[PDB]
Design a protein around this ligand. Structure first.
Ligand SMILES: Nc1ncnc2c1ncn2[C@@H]1O[C@H](CSCC[C@H](N)C(=O)O)[C@@H](O)[C@H]1O
Ligand SMILES: Nc1ncnc2c1ncn2[C@@H]1O[C@H](CSCC[C@H](N)C(=O)O)[C@@H](O)[C@H]1O
Ligand SMILES: Nc1ncnc2c1ncn2[C@@H]1O[C@H](CSCC[C@H](N)C(=O)O)[C@@H](O)[C@H]1O
Lengths: 258, 258, 258
């Protein structure tokens, strides 16, 4: 109970999965301070999951333990602990990629199922590794159990990495949708850019004003804004950019800043 | 960690916003007892948000701190702390209106961003004031930091108030939909009324029996009931009144009690 | 705060209901460790609720208190406490049936509303017994208040039980859908079966491979798998079996194992 353990998944909210994972954790670490991020990441989207954990890592105190489980390839992908000034407990499938931009890494461990089972006492399922591997590992780490006790160290440079950088051709960026929020605001992977006056969505016949807040255009109008995530956000004031553009996470857009 | 801090937002559940706000809070107040109400208030509905906080305030113990963030007009609206036998930490946009029916107010403070930034250490975003202003203020207040330290007192009668009272013309009430729940039950702003035998929805050709519970009519039938909120509830037994009537929050209905 | 109190409901996430119930609980038991399972059980589905509590009970430590509220028949159904090596606080409507497979029961109590009101102080509503009866009873039990103090013992064999066993005709099972998760994976009430090589959905013209993980078939293909729940799961790799089969909880399917 010294540090927080955060949870990010695509498991969904209807059913037992999250509760099972939490009770498994609290079994091991009864004083754990378990903080939900989301369990509503778009199904199997390791990209959107990575974005979400990135934002939470940026604001968490050092020593925080982050459990992330978006795991379509569950089965012989590795389960890993990344040990840094913060911890990540994640499938080795590139989920760690964005949060890793903000963590100084000391070491990486592959979790050994046999050694986890020692601590839990129950059969490791083929598919629900949040309950049987990742949650327990997070709880154990926060309890002061060294990853060496349930895993073995592996090279930091061996882990799966997502391709997340945007492309630029001349004055045209080719940007990827990395997150869409419940408003339908659309987050694109452009960061560290000088603020423009205009953002052109070349594929859509739209030249959007770049403004600080939604209420600086009429209701129903589309704009671009900084948002709170240090990327580029496209929004409809009191509406859904995602619906109007018919875009989804992973879609690429041609974008010019003017 | 002496009193509860409740959270009510329209931020949604898919993404990092709620987790960011929580970790920001726990940074400041590691022992905070943070209780989620909802983050699924209808987008930008200050009215439905106010209703939801009203119901939670009614059942919370004195000293409880209520953070509410439904903030379409974020940008030069004020961020305020209402100091009473309970606290409200809200945008000055009328969200406080219904909960204020149940709080004895001592004083009101405008939060000064510059003074909050002193405590957090990070740049205040243009749009995510839950993370950068409201959550921190709630955490600070519960930690025993006086609002005077990060704000300045303003008159209680200067704050934005929602128009929430129903209208009556003769024997006809003109009622507003203030909440629709996940069942599609429809809550109308009529309170403190003598229970009728019948509730006529004049616009809809319906004369509904007023009954204590859903199971007192056949499945699929519509009724009116008291519910648990001290308003008037319209429901379909095992169905959705909202869908059948095609109504939304803010819609007005002509209603007669017989 | 010695043991966990878990919460499973169909109340939904949009609105005040869950927050009200939690603040009522924490009023009574300020140190309660309240663990959300789900509030997104399919409306009024006592069957799916029972499944969800079953899975959480299986992984909770002894002494855990489980509050379950899926209560379409609220009104003269009983409110009960099941006292065992774990506790259940539930409507007497068969919600307890699946979790009871995993609990050694000592005694059962009917909650007496008048005696609960002694402890809460407020009027018991006709419909929101989570806030006014079940949550308080859970909080009180975890606080060390004996059920005898707010109820009266009743025979364990008098409580409502769901019919949950599958039927078999020759080599054909008639299985019921007991849960559908957020992926659209479909859980059928077949347990304790020898793993087949093939699962035929006789009604659908499908002969599915039985495999350990989703990624063992092409994307879009349907399979059967063990899952993590000790039942039988039907899934589309990276899709929705529920949508493809057009099935809902309670639907019955003819199924042959080959
Ligand atoms: N598209 C939109 N139009 C108008 N207001 C919006 C909006 N999207 C979010 N909001 C308002 O923004 C408030 C704060 S949430 C801000 C989220 C934004 N994407 C960010 O990263 O900063 C919410 O209460 C919501 O009502
Ligand atoms: N429209 C409806 N028809 C039948 N049962 C309903 C219903 N709406 C809610 N319920 C049942 O009510 C139970 C308790 S929630 C009650 C909510 C109600 N609006 C109130 O304020 O009191 C739930 O478990 C749900 O299954
Ligand atoms: N139908 C499906 N196809 C592919 N992957 C799936 C899937 N359903 C769940 N998953 C993946 O499974 C991971 C773990 S959740 C596993 C749930 C499964 N029903 C069980 O009881 O074990 C999730 O992160 C999700 O991305």
């Amino acid at each position: 109970g010294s540090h927080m353990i955060t949870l990010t998944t695509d498991f969904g909210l209807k059913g037992p999965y999250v509760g099972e994972m939490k009770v498994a954790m609290l079994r091991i670490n009864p004083n754990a301070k378990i903080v939900d991020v989301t369990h509503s990441v778009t199904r199997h989207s390791i990209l959107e999951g990575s974005f979400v954990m990135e934002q939470v890592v940026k604001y968490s105190p050092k020593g925080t333990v982050h459990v992330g489980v978006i795991d379509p390839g569950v089965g012989e992908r590795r389960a890993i602990v990344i040990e840094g000034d913060q911890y990540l407990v994640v499938p080795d499938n590139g989920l760690a990629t964005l949060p890793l931009k903000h963590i100084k890494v000391k070491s990486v461990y592959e979790i050994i199922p046999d050694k986890i089972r020692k601590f839990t006492g129950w059969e490791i399922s083929s598919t629900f590794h949040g309950r049987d591997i990742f949650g327990p590992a997070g709880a154990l780490i926060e309890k002061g159990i060294h990853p060496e006790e349930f895993g073995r160290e592996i090279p930091v440079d061996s882990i799966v990495k997502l391709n997340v950088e945007p492309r630029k051709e001349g004055d045209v960026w080719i940007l990827k949708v990395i997150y869409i929020d419940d408003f339908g605001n659309v987050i694109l992977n452009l960061e560290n850019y000088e603020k423009p006056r205009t953002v052109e969505l070349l594929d859509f016949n739209l030249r959007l004003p770049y403004l600080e807040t939604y209420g600086l255009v009429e209701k129903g109008e589309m704009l671009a804004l900084p948002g709170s995530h240090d990327y580029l956000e496209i929004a409809v004031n009191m509406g859904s950019a995602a619906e109007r553009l018919n875009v989804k996470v992973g879609d690429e857009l041609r974008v010019r800043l003017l």
